[PDB]
């Protein structure tokens, strides 16, 4: 599944709902800390719609548990990420992923 650990608290009040657009900064890392992706490197917040399944399952369910302003560490099992196949060249098979996610606003 996905484990959500707070880095810095949000408002504790505004949680994203299905159909809402979520605006975040994130960094994605393998288990050894190797970064494979980061919106912060692009200096461009990333937007996705909750429930569209345009992000991995661990994000769908993990970010849904975050409040606006919150920064959290999401630890995501492979079945909630890229599974047995992984993404060859980037993500190994059966990889646990760690994401640093900051929820900036809802749209």
Descriptive overview:
It is a single chain. By secondary structure, this protein is mainly β. The chain has a single domain, classed as Roll (Chitinase A, domain 3), CATH 3.10.50.40. The protein contains two helices and six strands, in the order βββαβαββ. The N and C termini lie far apart (26 Å). Pfam families: FKBP_C. One of its GO terms (biological process) is regulation of immune response. GO terms for molecular function: activin receptor binding; calcium channel regulator activity; FK506 binding; I-SMAD binding; macrolide binding; peptidyl-prolyl cis-trans isomerase activity; signaling receptor inhibitor activity; transforming growth factor beta receptor binding. It catalyses: [protein]-peptidylproline (omega=180) = [protein]-peptidylproline (omega=0).
What is the rounded distance between the termini?
Answer: 26 Å
CATH topology: Chitinase A, domain 3
What structural category arises from helix and sheet content? mainly beta
- In the residues, how many domains can be counted? 1
Family: Belongs to the FKBP-type PPIase family. FKBP1 subfamily.
Enzyme class: isomerase
Modified residues (N6-succinyllysine): 52
Pfam families: FKBP_C
Ordered list of secondary-structure elements with their pairings:
Blueprint: E1 2-8, E2 21-29, E3 35-38, H1 39-42, E4 46-49, H2 57-63, E5 71-76, E6 97-106
Antiparallel strand pairs: 1-5, 2-3, 2-4, 2-6, 5-6
């Amino acid at each position: 599944g996905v484990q959500v650990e707070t880095i810095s608290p949000g408002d504790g009040r505004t949680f994203p709902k299905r159909g809402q657009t979520v605006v975040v900064h994130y960094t994605g890392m393998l288990e050894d800390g190797k970064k494979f992706d980061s919106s912060r490197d692009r200096n461009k917040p990333f937007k996705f719609m909750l429930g569209k399944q345009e992000v991995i399952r661990g994000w769908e369910e993990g970010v849904a548990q975050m409040s606006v302003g919150q920064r959290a560490k999401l630890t995501i099992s492979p079945d909630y990420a890229y599974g047995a196949t992984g993404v060859p060249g980037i993500i190994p098979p059966h990889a646990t992923l760690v994401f640093d996610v900051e929820l900036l606003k809802l749209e």
